[PDB]
Write an enzyme that holds these catalytic residues in place. Sequence first.
Site, mmCIF file in Angstrom:
data_model
loop_
_atom_site.group_PDB
_atom_site.id
_atom_site.type_symbol
_atom_site.label_atom_id
_atom_site.label_comp_id
_atom_site.label_asym_id
_atom_site.label_seq_id
_atom_site.Cartn_x
_atom_site.Cartn_y
_atom_site.Cartn_z
ATOM 1 N N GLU A 70 0.819 -1.206 0.000
ATOM 2 C CA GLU A 70 0.000 0.000 0.000
ATOM 3 C C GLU A 70 0.854 1.257 0.000
ATOM 4 O OE1 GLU A 70 -3.153 -0.011 -0.523
ATOM 5 O OE2 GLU A 70 -3.509 -2.126 -0.166
ATOM 6 N N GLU A 92 -1.594 9.403 0.346
ATOM 7 C CA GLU A 92 -1.959 9.212 -1.062
ATOM 8 C C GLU A 92 -1.381 10.364 -1.890
ATOM 9 O OE1 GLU A 92 -6.031 8.448 -3.704
ATOM 10 O OE2 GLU A 92 -6.068 8.237 -1.535
#
Length: 245
Positions: A70, A92
């Site tokens: 991730e 992100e």
Amino acid sequence: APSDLSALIPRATFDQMLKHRNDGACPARGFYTYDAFIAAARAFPSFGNTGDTATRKREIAAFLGQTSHETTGGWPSAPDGPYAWGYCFVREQNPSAYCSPTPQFPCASGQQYYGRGPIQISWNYNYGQCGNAIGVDLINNPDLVATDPVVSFKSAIWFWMTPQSPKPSSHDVITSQWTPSAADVAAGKLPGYGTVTNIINGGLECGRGQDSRVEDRIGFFKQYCDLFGVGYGNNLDCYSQAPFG
């Protein structure tokens, strides 16, 4: 045999696994500490403490493998290979709102619920559930997952430990505490790392044949199992599983 998580995965082992996270090219350098991982795990005492020694190590390898994917900064010709570049970032890359407001989980005006931390937790309703479980107001302060490393690791271990019907927890799957129903068998969901991938992102990554995201999850898991000196188990991919809804 190791009495606790610190003994199971010593500082030097954690730092070998996550060998490049503090390199200059990693935007999260200096953020993810071993101390924060050990401290966060206290909020979920059965994490890494379920089953025999091999099973406990397999769980920690699987958790680090999934979360490494991730947050990976790897590339094929990266030094030490792509499976040495986990935990390279914490937010992100491009922001979005990730807001779907309900009475139970509102969206705080001015806040954004894009991916943060080791499992890249996203959406107000996930931040909301997580914060309720760990004692932090992540509706009003979701960026704590990217500024406080103990909150960061707590959010990822929360995700790992928490069933969300119809999904079992990743914990229960990887530590052989979950047995598939007849329907689950028909859906190809057998115990192993692949069913964990399905729990995490199967609606995009599973049931579609070989997938580079899944291959990256597996490569990290194998690298960490190798360091621990444990086998991988079976059912490593989800390439013909039905995605969990």
